[PDB]
Design a protein around this ligand. Structure first.
Ligand SMILES: [Mn+2]
Ligand SMILES: [Mn+2]
Ligand SMILES: [Mn+2]
Length: 430
DNA sequence: ATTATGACGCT
DNA sequence: AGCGTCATA
C-alpha cells in the first residue's frame, strides 16, 4: 500500500544521436546528405566493414557489420564515407571530437553520464523542480512538445503517423494534474519539455539530430529512446510499464541482451519482461544471484536505482587492432612495428587528454589475442605508465608480452598474433 | 575476416 | 590483478 516504493523519484533522460558517424560525415560532405549512405572501415576486404548506416539506407536492408560489397548488393546507389586511417589503422578521432561537441552542450543543462561515443544519461530531477516552480501551475502546451511521443497512447474510444503522435500527446496532456508539483507524470512531462530544448540546442549548434527517452530511470530511458527513432523523443511513464513490458522480449532490456538474458528465458521458461513479476525476489536471486535477482525483481516492475554518474569523460584511452586471417603477426619486428604504431596513436591521444582535461594516466594495459583462441582477448598484462612516450610504451608493452612467443627462435613469433591492444588507465589529477 | 573501442562484474 | 560480460559506432 502506502509503503510500496514505485521507482518514481527521479526524472532521467537518455539522449542518443541518430546514425551518428553517418551524420558526422554528412555534415562534412553535403553530397551525402539525405541519401542512403554508410560509414565503412577499411576497404580491401569485401569493400570494408560497415559501422554506421543512414535511415535511407536502412530501408534497403543495409545494417551494421555488413561488408560494403554485400550492402551494395541490397543498395546499389549506397554512398560510403571511410574512417580515417593513420599509422596503418582506423582512427576514430573525428567521431570522438564530434561526441565532445554534443556532450558539452548537454552538460549545460545538467550533469551527464557519458554512456557511449554517441549517448549520455541526464538526471533532470533538479532541473524539473526548478522549471515547475517557474511554471507557476501553468498547464503544459502541446507546442512545447513538438517531437514527443507518449508511449501507450493514444488508447481507447486519423491514419497518419504524426496524427497519431498528436492524439497520444493530447490524451496525455488532457489527463495531467499540473496542480501537483510532486506528481511523477507531471515531472516526466516537464522533463520532456527540457529534453526538447536540449535536442533543439544540439541540432542548432552542431547540425546533428538525435532521439531521446524520458523516464524515471536509466533502463527505461534507454528503452524509450529507441521506440521512435530517428529525430523523436519518447516518454515512458511508470503507468505505461505493465503494457509495454507484457510483450517486450527480455533481451531488449539493457544488460539482458547476452547470456544472462538467455538464462532468464531458459530457466524460467518465459519470453517477456512482464512475465518476471510472477517470481518472488528470493526465487530470482536463487537463479541469478543476489544482485541480479533483486535487480530483476524491481526492473520488471519498472523500478531501477542505478544513478546517473557524474562522468563526462572516458576513464580509459585505448588503441586496438585486429590482424585477421593471414595478416596475423608472425615476426618480432612486425609485432614491434605495430606496438609502436598503436603507442604513437595512444601518445597522441594521451597528450591531448592531459592538456584538455588536467589528468594523467598511470597504468598501461597490454592485451593480445593468439591464433586459435576464440576469446576476444587471450592475455592481458599491466605495467607502469610513467611517461607519455610512444617508444617507451611500445618497448614496455613488448617486454610484458615477449614470453608469449612459443617459438624457439626469437626472430619468429608463434603462434601468430591476431590482435594487439594498448590501454591507458588509472588517471590521476594533474 | 566485423572492428575499435569502453564500462563494470567476478574471484 | 586478470578474465569475463555486455555494450555501442
Ligand atoms: Mn545512436
Ligand atoms: Mn548509442
Ligand atoms: Mn546503434
Amino acid at each position: 500500500g502506502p509503503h510500496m516504493a514505485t521507482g518514481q523519484d527521479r526524472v532521467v533522460a537518455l539522449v542518443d544521436m541518430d546514425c551518428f558517424f553517418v551524420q558526422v560525415e554528412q555534415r562534412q560532405n553535403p553530397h551525402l546528405r539525405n541519401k542512403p549512405c554508410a560509414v565503412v572501415q577499411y576497404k580491401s576486404w569485401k569493400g570494408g566493414g560497415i559501422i554506421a548506416v543512414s535511415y535511407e539506407a536502412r530501408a534497403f536492408g543495409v545494417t551494421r557489420s555488413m561488408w560494403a560489397d554485400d550492402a551494395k548488393k541490397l543498395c546499389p546507389d549506397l554512398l560510403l564515407a571511410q574512417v580515417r586511417e593513420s599509422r596503418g589503422k582506423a582512427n576514430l578521432t573525428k567521431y570522438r571530437e564530434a561526441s565532445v561537441e554534443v556532450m558539452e552542450i548537454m552538460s549545460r543543462f545538467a550533469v551527464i553520464e557519458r554512456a557511449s561515443i554517441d549517448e549520455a544519461y541526464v538526471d533532470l530531477t533538479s532541473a524539473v523542480q526548478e522549471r515547475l516552480q517557474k511554471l507557476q501551475g501553468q498547464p503544459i502546451s502541446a507546442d512545447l512538445l513538438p517531437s514527443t511521443y507518449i508511449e501507450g497512447l493514444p488508447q481507447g474510444p486519423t491514419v497518419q503517423k504524426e496524427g497519431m503522435r498528436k492524439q497520444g500527446l493530447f490524451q496525455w496532456l488532457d489527463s495531467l494534474q499540473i496542480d501537483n508539483l510532486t506528481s511523477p507524470d507531471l515531472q516526466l512531462t516537464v522533463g520532456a519539455v527540457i529534453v526538447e530544448e536540449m535536442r533543439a540546442a544540439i541540432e542548432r549548434e552542431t547540425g546533428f539530430q538525435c532521439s531521446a527517452g524520458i523516464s524515471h530511470n536509466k533502463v527505461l530511458a534507454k528503452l524509450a529512446c529507441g521506440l521512435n527513432k530517428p529525430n523523436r523523443q519518447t516518454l515512458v511513464s511508470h503507468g505505461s510499464v505493465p503494457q509495454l513490458f507484457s510483450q517486450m522480449p527480455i533481451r531488449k532490456i539493457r544488460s539482458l541482451g547476452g547470456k544472462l538474458g538467455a538464462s532468464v528465458i531458459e530457466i524460467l521458461g518465459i519470453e517477456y519482461m512482464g512475465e518476471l513479476t510472477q517470481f518472488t525476489e528470493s526465487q530470482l536471486q536463487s537463479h541469478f544471484g543476489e544482485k541480479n535477482g533483486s535487480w530483476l525483481y524491481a526492473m520488471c516492475r519498472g523500478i531501477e536505482h542505478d544513478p546517473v554518474k557524474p562522468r563526462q569523460l572516458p576513464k580509459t584511452i585505448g588503441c586496438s587492432k585486429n590482424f585477421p586471417g593471414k595478416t596475423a603477426l608472425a615476426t618480432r619486428e612486425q609485432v614491434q612495428w605495430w606496438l609502436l604504431q598503436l603507442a604513437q596513436e595512444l601518445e597522441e591521444r594521451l597528450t591531448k587528454d592531459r592538456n584538455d582535461n588536467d589528468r594523467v594516466a598511470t597504468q598501461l594495459v597490454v592485451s593480445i589475442r593468439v591464433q586459435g583462441d576464440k576469446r576476444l582477448s587471450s592475455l592481458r598484462r599491466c605495467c607502469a605508465l610513467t611517461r607519455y612516450d610512444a617508444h617507451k610504451m611500445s618497448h614496455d608493452a613488448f617486454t610484458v608480452i615477449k614470453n608469449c612467443n612459443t617459438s624457439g627462435i626469437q626472430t619468429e613469433w608463434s603462434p601468430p598474433l591476431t590482435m594487439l591492444f594498448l590501454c591507458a588507465t588509472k588517471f590521476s589529477a594533474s
